[PDB]
């Protein structure tokens, strides 16, 4: 290759063949002129050792180059190892029609879509926009359309919205561990420079939004658009391949919003009033006449489908709270009510999506997951669930326990100075009394947080 400066670089094969051709020509000249035997023995040893420096140089680090006596590369080193051809250029290739940026959340998305910036969308889709611009007849040749997207005119963006609409892309976080590491979405265009990824799907990537960089690929051909939509769409992967549990578990803010929404305090507004449905539970909480969690008899109507696929409607007055009713507006028809009557942390919402998928199929689990994410972020916002420094309560019994443990290590200290106990018995005794005092302090703080 030509470098710059009147100076060229190349592979080491040219240097090794230069060396082998030099030994072969020096051997032809020395056997053509009838040399004595010891000279041509040194000759054939250097030629055998030259070819053995060419076919594989790893076994004898002999072939060395100037200013840094390093082993040169060779053919077996061109095939072997991490940087040969099999692992570097055949199993995984550098791939066109791709791109990469920083991810960010944007929870207004349905989970079958993701954001994508307009600049990357125009750079990824230059061939399709070329074809549409000479299809509708706004240009003659490929270079006129190349001036049109090189100029970024006004008509190319409706063209771009007419080539996005039903075309998947493939998102990919870079250390792909399991088969959920590559999924496929549909773009929504973003005034910005960052891929807006659906939040729940983030837990499948083991991703966090502190600067992870996800890469997009484009399925060009038609069968790959159908392989992206039918096998790899983000709705068509809501269970892990490793276990039959859901992988669209609501991750961190949304379970705090639900856990704040379905609980109870013993005395808030609207205590012990009856409510005709979940609709006026929403209408009570939005006004402020009730609280979001105060216990309330309601009349709910659940549809248990114990017939042959036809849903049986039953209605009653469950003793519940208002937040459980506002959540009950979202749960679809086939589920029973007793799944929302508990506290709904992360385990209970995980088996909520599990029973929803195992009873009502796929589409109520997708739309039920989207509605859980929307109400979880909304009522997490209404929560204001902060953290302050006065929120972590020290035990009042802490220094007493630590002082008793100090007296006890004083006791075992004296018994070690008294020569009654050994070193290892002092060791096991000290670790045991510190572990016991540790558990006493832990139960003190845990009670004094949870029930105080």
């Amino acid at each position: 290759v030509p470098l710059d400066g009147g100076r060229f670089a190349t592979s080491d094969l040219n240097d090794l063949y230069r060396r082998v051709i030099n030994r072969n020509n020096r051997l032809k000249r020395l056997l053509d002129l009838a040399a004595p035997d010891i000279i041509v023995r040194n000759e054939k040893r250097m030629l055998q050792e030259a070819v053995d420096a060419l076919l594989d140089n790893g076994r004898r680090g002999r072939a060395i180059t100037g200013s840094n006596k390093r082993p040169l590369k060779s053919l077996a080193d061109m095939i072997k190892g991490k940087q040969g051809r099999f692992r570097q250029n055949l199993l995984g290739k550098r791939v066109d029609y791709s791109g990469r940026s920083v991810i960010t959340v944007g929870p207004y998305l349905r989970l079958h879509q993701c954001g994508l910036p307009k600049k990357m969308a125009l750079e990824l889709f230059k061939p399709f926009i070329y074809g549409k611009l000479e299809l509708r007849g706004l240009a003659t040749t490929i270079k006129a359309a190349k001036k049109m997207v090189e100029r970024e005119e006004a008509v190319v963006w409706d063209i771009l919205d007419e080539v996005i609409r039903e075309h998947p892309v493939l998102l990919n976080r870079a250390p792909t561990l399991h088969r959920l590491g590559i999924q496929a979405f549909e773009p929504v265009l973003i005034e910005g420079k960052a891929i807006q990824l659906h939040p729940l799907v983030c837990a499948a990537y083991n991703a966090d939004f502190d600067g992870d960089q996800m890469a997009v690929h484009v399925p060009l051909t038609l069968e790959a658009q159908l392989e992206a939509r039918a096998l790899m769409m983000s709705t068509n992967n809501i269970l892990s391949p490793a276990n039959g549990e859901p992988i669209i578990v609501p991750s961190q803010d949304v379970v705090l919003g639900l856990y704040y929404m379905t609980r109870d305090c013993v005395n808030a507004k609207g205590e012990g009033m009856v409510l005709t449905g979940p609709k006026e539970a929403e209408r009570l909480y939005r006004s402020g006449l009730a609280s979001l969690h105060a216990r309330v008899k309601v009349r709910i109507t659940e549809y248990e489908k114990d017939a042959n696929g036809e849903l049986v409607a039953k209605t009653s007055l469950k003793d519940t709270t208002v937040g459980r009713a506002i959540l009950w507006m979202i749960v679809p028809k086939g589920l029973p009510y007793s799944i929302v009557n508990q506290a709904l942390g992360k385990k209970a919402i995980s088996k909520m999506l599990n029973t929803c998928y195992r009873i009502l199929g796929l589409k109520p689990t997708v739309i039920f997951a989207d509605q859980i994410m929307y109400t979880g972020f909304a009522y997490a916002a209404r929560s204001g669930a902060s953290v302050g420094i006065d929120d972590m309560v020290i035990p009042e019994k802490k220094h007493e326990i630590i002082s008793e443990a100090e007296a006890e290590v004083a006791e075992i200290q004296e018994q070690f100075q008294s020569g009654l106990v050994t070193a290892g018995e002092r060791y096991n005794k000290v670790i045991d009394i510190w572990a016991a005092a540790n558990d006493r302090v832990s139960k003190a703080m845990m009670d004094n947080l949870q029930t105080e």
């Binding site: 060229f8 670089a9 100037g66 840094n68 006596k69």
Partner: peptide
């Protein structure tokens, strides 16, 4: 008249430890 280019070849691995392999 030869200015043979093999006398201009960049030693492009001029920072490697000599005991490393495959390159």
């Amino acid at each position: 008249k030869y200015e043979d280019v093999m006398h201009r070849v960049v030693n492009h691995a001029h920072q490697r430890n000599p005991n490393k392999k495959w390159s």
